[PDB]
Design an enzyme around this catalytic site. Structure first.
Site, PDB file in Angstrom:
ATOM      1  N   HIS F  45      20.320  17.979  -3.163  1.00  0.00           N
ATOM      2  CA  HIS F  45      21.349  19.002  -2.849  1.00  0.00           C
ATOM      3  C   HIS F  45      21.441  19.328  -1.363  1.00  0.00           C
ATOM      4  CE1 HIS F  45      17.671  21.443  -3.763  1.00  0.00           C
ATOM      5  NE2 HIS F  45      18.055  22.158  -2.724  1.00  0.00           N
ATOM      6  N   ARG F  70      14.674   8.663   1.505  1.00  0.00           N
ATOM      7  CA  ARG F  70      15.299   7.965   0.386  1.00  0.00           C
ATOM      8  C   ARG F  70      16.823   8.184   0.443  1.00  0.00           C
ATOM      9  NH1 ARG F  70      16.962   8.804  -5.113  1.00  0.00           N
ATOM     10  NH2 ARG F  70      16.079   7.162  -6.480  1.00  0.00           N
ATOM     11  N   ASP F  84      19.805   5.302  12.727  1.00  0.00           N
ATOM     12  CA  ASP F  84      20.218   5.859  14.017  1.00  0.00           C
ATOM     13  C   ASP F  84      19.646   7.230  14.274  1.00  0.00           C
ATOM     14  OD1 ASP F  84      21.543   3.619  14.829  1.00  0.00           O
ATOM     15  OD2 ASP F  84      23.536   4.356  14.319  1.00  0.00           O
ATOM     16  N   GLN F 147      12.791   0.560  -4.659  1.00  0.00           N
ATOM     17  CA  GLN F 147      12.429   1.320  -5.839  1.00  0.00           C
ATOM     18  C   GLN F 147      12.864   0.528  -7.077  1.00  0.00           C
ATOM     19  OE1 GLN F 147      13.550   5.358  -5.647  1.00  0.00           O
ATOM     20  NE2 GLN F 147      12.810   5.862  -7.695  1.00  0.00           N
ATOM     21  N   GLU F 149      13.343   0.647 -11.109  1.00  0.00           N
ATOM     22  CA  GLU F 149      13.568   1.781 -12.003  1.00  0.00           C
ATOM     23  C   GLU F 149      13.996   1.351 -13.418  1.00  0.00           C
ATOM     24  OE1 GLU F 149      15.974   4.973 -10.196  1.00  0.00           O
ATOM     25  OE2 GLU F 149      15.806   4.085  -8.216  1.00  0.00           O
ATOM     26  N   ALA F 174       9.451   7.904 -14.620  1.00  0.00           N
ATOM     27  CA  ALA F 174      10.386   8.570 -15.535  1.00  0.00           C
ATOM     28  C   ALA F 174      11.596   7.689 -15.866  1.00  0.00           C
ATOM     29  CB  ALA F 174      10.809   9.906 -14.991  1.00  0.00           C
ATOM     30  N   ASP F 175      12.222   7.089 -14.850  1.00  0.00           N
ATOM     31  CA  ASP F 175      13.392   6.253 -15.093  1.00  0.00           C
ATOM     32  C   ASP F 175      13.007   5.006 -15.858  1.00  0.00           C
ATOM     33  OD1 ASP F 175      15.098   8.014 -13.718  1.00  0.00           O
ATOM     34  OD2 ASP F 175      14.989   6.871 -11.856  1.00  0.00           O
TER      35      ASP F 175
END
Lengths: 253, 253, 251, 253, 251, 251
Positions: F45, F70, F84, F147, F149, F174-175
């Site tokens: 968020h 990430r 950058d 990653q 998943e 979890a995924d």
């Protein structure tokens, strides 16, 4: 948590600085790496208040340049919050007399030496209680610089200089000349004389004189007279003058 | 850099305005194009402080509507920063007597006429020194409007009206009626009489009367009595009433 | 954590809404108390991205009005983040065919029904794991509305209507009329006919028709034809038109 | 619009709270659901000022936990804006004597009972005029808590307790012990005695005592003595201690 | 609502510009009054997304300097939002071929000339419908500049130059020289030759060549060859170099 | 400008980390001093986009803890902007196959090793050209972690492990467990077996295995099997659980 700016002043090593009128932590960091001894966080249109000062202090932290923060006035609350966010050197505006100077100093020191509140929550100042014996060490590392901007303040200088905890006295030429009757004309001989003799007087009292001067030769003159914190430019002047000069090299086409 | 709002008041041309309680520069611009003579920047939940006023002034700049800014009180620091960001017309709250009115005026004028600081950095007010002779021209273009909100202030009106530099006197009906003992009931005859006679008295003194009135017929009445800056609505009232009326046309289904 | 907007549509109760072009959580709250059944979070100049959606959802939460969020496109990553911050009803733009409608639906459902990631951190969506059995309950409370904006989408409407998980089909009159050759003039009979036929067809399939329409008579017309989520104005239009009318009365 | 926190205090039901030093409306909501009776909005580095308090109040609104806001001092303007954004319970810092306590109270009440301005625009406090008879009902739902932080304030407690409208008196152990000569050492017997007897004295006067205490057993002790609003932790302490303990379980590898 | 930058290019009047890497609307205004014909809104760390572009456009609006905005890529949704907030000249990155140049152009034009959505809410672009006949006038005032950054794009330049609606072609020397094997050294003769030949070719096709070049002599060289939008510095370079030189004088 | 996290992995020194779901630079600094070897900037968020990453990097800079960022997906433009602003270690989500792992690597390297743009303006990454020979030194200090998943990604793991420039492979329990049919229950033996076998295999190939695991015993188990970057908690879980336990003691 030793205040290296305060120690440098105490040791008589002159510190060359830049005044920051922009509030960006991005430009603050860009300027922090430019080779100044100190940077003055003094923006007049800061968006996020103390949080703006937090991000500027975070930007500057890993660099050799030391931050000084100018609260908008000698405001005990403002001072308390700036110290809690981790400010150790303050430039306090419109100090007119010794009482006001002593109040600025007392605002920065825990009881009994002052009225600074220990407060209820952990603060960035102690790095959330990770600095050992912070409460015991803090007072000695606070550096109070007072700004004299008027005939009245200049009148009261010997008494201000007598205040324990006033580490330095900063002269703002523009405001002083305005108050002397030469607004926009600090180069007038009577004004330059008053500034030169204040700088010598501060230095002779064993305290640090400071000033803002964008004229490079005048700045050098003040340094010879013994000024120990000299701001030699302002970020927004650097940018405006560089941009205008560049556009003029081509003219509008 | 001529203040067209101040010139219009001086010339007796009435100025129709809208009060802005939202801080958005997007809504400010949306409203700046709606056909008002002036807009009052008066938000009570502004996020970015002086920077919020900067973006509202930038939004409004190319439009015919003129900005007026209401600081949250007669605060010399607040006033200095609003003038530096480029405000030329202020509505100063809670002016109770002539001393307070003279202090508001003096805060807006450079020495010797006042105590406004020339300051250390370039400011948007001078467009970063691009307005020729800004220091010499600035004082005459500042427009000070004082807000009278109490029986005490109304009592002191003839003296406030005598203060040089007070260009206008604004009456807030809600606060005055509350202080008179009719909170929420400004339409009470004794209250309306006090407002009408203040408006006439201000005008007869050669100064501009102002008021906020959302009732369209009452607003017209005040304009006939000689009110010269009349805010006729508030942005958030316009929005809330329009939305409620629209939902009611359909009912919750 | 029942999705009450979704249940209302399913029950055939029409929902009267307002489109939000402003991003402010202050104006969102001011509007959430004005009496609408739903508010559409659709701002095109939002400052804080998902965070701006967070403060609008927080503002709206205690009111009867239900939020619906319009991601800027059918972007699985954008949808993941909006769902994690707590969005349960999405209006998905520019859905042109049944494949795109299915992708939008799968983006909102945990495996094996969809591709929604359970994620590494707690999320507002589960109220930080305070909603019991959130993972098992979440899928059935997601409400997916697809926006039809072109002749191509209209052509594929029958197929889109066959996509399970599509709860609603929203028609945007301005874009459709432009695609049809009447930009700026949805009032043309050819546009109105396409719109009204679509509404009937959507409702016929047992899905909710939706539309934005600021003209009250047309709004009542669409409601009569069976539309179930009708946005009847935009916050910035209300403000601009009220301000302009006010200034004019003194001109 | 009934203030349930004020009603709980009045009824002698103790309220367990958490102090918020972070300003995030995201963490505010995360904490609002954690099972506290009240949350104290007291951040010292808030970015968006009153707008920051707006989003925290919006985050907390649907939860059982009740918000209390601590303005940075007993500032009539700050108080007016916090009440307009919808704050109904204030913790007012540095109340030193009964005059200051009466001023805090009067700032929260419309005339004639106080000086709170009805103002010109609709406000969140009245939910934009949607709360029927808001003006008539508001005064009775304001809850004023005063913070005593010094020997002088403790000295003046019987008079502060005599002020009508002071609903509660909050003791900050850290600041009081600093002022008593034991900075960082609130556990010193003389300090604990002063706090215990203040808590009993407040309670015996029919008013609510409050305190912040992170030691769980000490907190329980204060609750037995009759403390009715007890903050038992601070968000940033919870986070810092949990993170440090977690990293230590693994050591830097 | 005439696009004056676009008209200047069309008239063959060169436009001297400054590239903005900072996002601040305060520094944008400070620079808008410094004397440039145009300013390029290209910040890579903008905080408020479209909203940040809104405040820069608002800051710049009353000055003679014309804004140009660089979306982070040739993203139709990003372009839609920038156009809605009022952008009329776009510098579109990484245009590699004529198909991508055409997509950028179509993204800026209402049907049937393009795919730009009329949208549901009023937008700043039309000044909330206060610009009469905005829908009919808008297309002709959009100015699309495509950025060529690779050998591949250079190879396809003749085709890109045949795309109607491409008003300008901007060459980025640093990226091109890197793609060519000289990263950090655009001064190499092979890079300069490719750049200068491209400028001649662009102007020959009746389109505007553009380029960013902080070296004054090279800038005058490109102008001599017919370049029409030349950005001659970057705000953050000006500041960093001025600060560094200043500190050095006291060291 | 040595990447010390990258060197530690290469030397086989395990790094204990904390996942940051909050975006605040104040909480980032508070956590940077708590004793972790690395912190993962992963907020879903964030309010200020790249700017929010800027203030977290600035907060973390003077501490021993190393930042890793990430991006929300394997987005070359997002990666360009994060590099950058000064990011040197990236955790790239949803890498499903060797082609996607190679694309992530090439996105971080200047030509001819990759497609990273040198850009027009100075960037924080080079400290505004104050790092000597930055262009020549940068590539070797980039650290790319991919990653994994899904079952598909697990199937392609051997190929992903053959991609040069992939320094680390991060497993998200979890995924993965959801994709495998046990959403919400990574504890299942089939999930644990896939995880532990992957860790062994990754380390075997001379790359660093990583994982997020809030269970201390499991964390020590993975470390024993050779995992080198182990995130052992999330900031928002720490706060929520501590707050809840505290309130409960008084209930």
């Amino acid at each position: 948590m030793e205040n290296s700016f305060k120690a440098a002043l105490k040791a008589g090593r002159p510190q060359i600085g830049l005044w920051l009128g922009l509030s960006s932590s991005y430009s603050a960091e860009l300027l922090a790496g430019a080779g100044f001894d100190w940077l003055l966080i003094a923006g007049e249109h800061a968006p996020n208040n103390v949080q703006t000062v937090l991000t500027q202090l975070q930007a500057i932290a890993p660099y050799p340049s030391q931050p000084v923060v100018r609260p908008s006035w000698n405001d005990p609350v403002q001072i308390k919050q700036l110290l809690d966010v981790g400010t150790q050197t303050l430039l306090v505006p419109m100090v007119q007399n010794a009482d006001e100077a002593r109040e600025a100093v007392r605002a920065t020191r825990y009881p009994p030496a002052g009225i600074r509140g220990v407060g209820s929550a952990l603060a960035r100042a102690s790095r959330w209680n990770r600095i050992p014996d912070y409460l015991q060490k803090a007072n000695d590392q606070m550096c109070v610089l007072v700004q004299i901007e008027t005939r009245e303040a200049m009148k009261n200088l010997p008494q201000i200089l007598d205040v324990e905890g006033v580490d330095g006295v900063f002269i703002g030429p523009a405001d002083l000349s305005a108050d002397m009757g030469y607004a926009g004309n600090p180069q007038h001989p009577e004004v330059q004389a008053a500034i030169e003799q204040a700088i010598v007087q501060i230095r002779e009292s064993g305290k640090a004189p400071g000033i803002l001067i964008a004229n490079e030769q005048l700045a050098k003159r003040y340094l010879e007279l013994g000024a120990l914190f000299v701001a030699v430019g302002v970020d927004t002047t650097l940018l405006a003058r560089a941009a205008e000069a560049l556009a003029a090299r081509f003219g509008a086409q």
